[PDB]
């Protein structure tokens, strides 16, 4: 078994893509994260849904999780307002969670090794032609 | 809605339950993680598939020697997990698993998951785990059509 045969079809977005597309993909496809590439179409980072959640909730709400002293009646309306006119790049954190890359021809153990190094959930396969999740790797060996 | 309605069913395994069995579940159900509970059923931790991968790949392959060794993971896997429990699969400092009250509002859950930036939270009602709310599930609720 090699990278290419292991890989599955993961949706991908660009740095300059709509922030909204990314949110919709995460939500529609119920994915825990998105593969982000640059203009070239080469791997850049991974944008986890939890980072998007962080971006979408106002700081003042985040600072009062029990809502004991602040009011927000506009969560959904404001989610909508702050995505409009914004790119994927703005959703990303200060130090974007890097995206490990393996070849189309790497062995299972080569892939597992790299994944096991960063305890990363996902690797991109390049020749991006796909990606290999941890569970996919487990699925193969079992 | 409240945390109760937001939550979805999520598979759970015991801390002292069989490691191999948990991996079979992670693999088949194609899950990012399992919710781990203790003997009496209380939320304890999450077991991500990636951590299982870490557990299976020796450190000398972590720290290309992969390709210089005549050892295949598929073979080894059963050997490494025999007699082993979920507890041993966990990292030395297991991730906390935030647990929201079933009657929390959507705003509260959002505020919590934003603040903590956690991939999921368990939902509990009367000391029982009734499901979980992932980050993407939260997003799906806040951008749902109305």
Q: Which of A62, A112, A116 sits opposite B115 (nearest CB)?
A: A62
What's the resolution in A? 2.3
N-term to C-term CA, chain B: 14
Report d(CA B113, CA A82) in Å as an integer. Answer: 18
Q: Which of A61, A109, A140 sits opposite B66 (nearest CB)?
A: A109
List all residues 6 or more positions away from B69 whose beta carbon is below 8 Å from its beta carbon. A109, B61
- CB B35, CB A140: distance < 8 Å: no
Give the pair of three-digit tokens for residue B142: 């806040």
Q: Please name the residue that has the structure tokens 């079933």.
A: B102
> In chain A, helix, strand, coil percent, each to 5?
40, 25, 35
Query: B112 to each of A50, B70, B117, B122, how far by Cα in Å?
Result: 11, 47, 8, 12
List all residues 6 or more positions away from B131 whose beta carbon is below 8 Å from its beta carbon. B7, B8, B9, B10, B122, B123
What experimental approach yielded this model?
Answer: X-ray
Report the relative pairing of strands A12-14 and B12-14 from DSSP bridges. unpaired
Q: Residue B27 gets which letter from DSSP?
A: H
- CATH number for the domain that contains residue B85: 3.10.580.10
| Domain encompassing residue B139 | 2-146
Number of domains in chain B: 1
- CB B43, CB B14: distance < 8 Å: no
Report d(CA B39, CA A104) in Å as an integer. Answer: 43
Q: Which of B32, B50, B146 sits opposite A119 (nearest CB)?
A: B50
Report d(CA B121, CA B94) in Å as an integer. Answer: 15
Check B56 against A31: CB less than 8 A apart. Answer: no
Closest CA to B144 of A107, A27, A137: A27
Check B67 against A109: CB less than 8 A apart. Answer: yes
Residues of chain A with Cβ-Cβ distance to B31 below 8 Å are 135
Report d(CA A115, CA A12) in Å as an integer. Answer: 19
Question: Does residue B30 sit in helix, strand or coil?
Answer: coil
What DSSP assignment string belongs to B84-134?
-BHHHHS-SSPPP--EEETT-BHHHHHHHHHHHT-SEEEEEETTEEEEEEE
- Cβ–Cβ contacts within 10 Å for residue B64, how many? 8
Check B115 against A65: CB less than 8 A apart. Answer: yes
Closest CA to A53 of B139, B14, B76, B47: B139
List Cβ<8 Å contacts ≥24 apart for B69-76.
B69/A109, B71/A109, B72/A108, B72/A109, B73/A108, B73/A109, B73/A112, B73/A141, B74/A108, B74/A140, B74/A141, B74/A142
- CB B63, CB A116: distance < 8 Å: no
Residues of chain A with Cβ-Cβ distance to B138 below 8 Å are 49, 53
């Amino acid at each position: 078994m090699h990278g290419e045969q292991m890989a599955e079809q993961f949706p991908v977005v660009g740095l300059d893509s709509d922030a909204r597309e990314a949110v919709e993909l995460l939500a529609s496809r119920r994915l825990p994260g998105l593969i982000v590439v640059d203009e070239k179409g080469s791997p850049h980072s991974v944008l986890p849904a939890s980072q998007v959640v962080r971006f979408l909730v106002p700081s003042y709400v985040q600072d009062d999780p029990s809502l004991a002293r602040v009011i927000d009646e506009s969560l959904a309306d404001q989610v909508a307002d702050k995505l409009a006119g914004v790119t994927v790049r703005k959703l990303l954190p200060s130090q974007p969670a890097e995206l490990p890359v393996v070849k189309h021809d790497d062995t299972v153990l080569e892939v597992a090794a790299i994944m096991a190094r960063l305890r990363c959930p996902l690797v991109a396969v390049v020749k991006i032609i796909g990606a290999i999740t941890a569970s996919r790797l487990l699925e193969l060996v079992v």
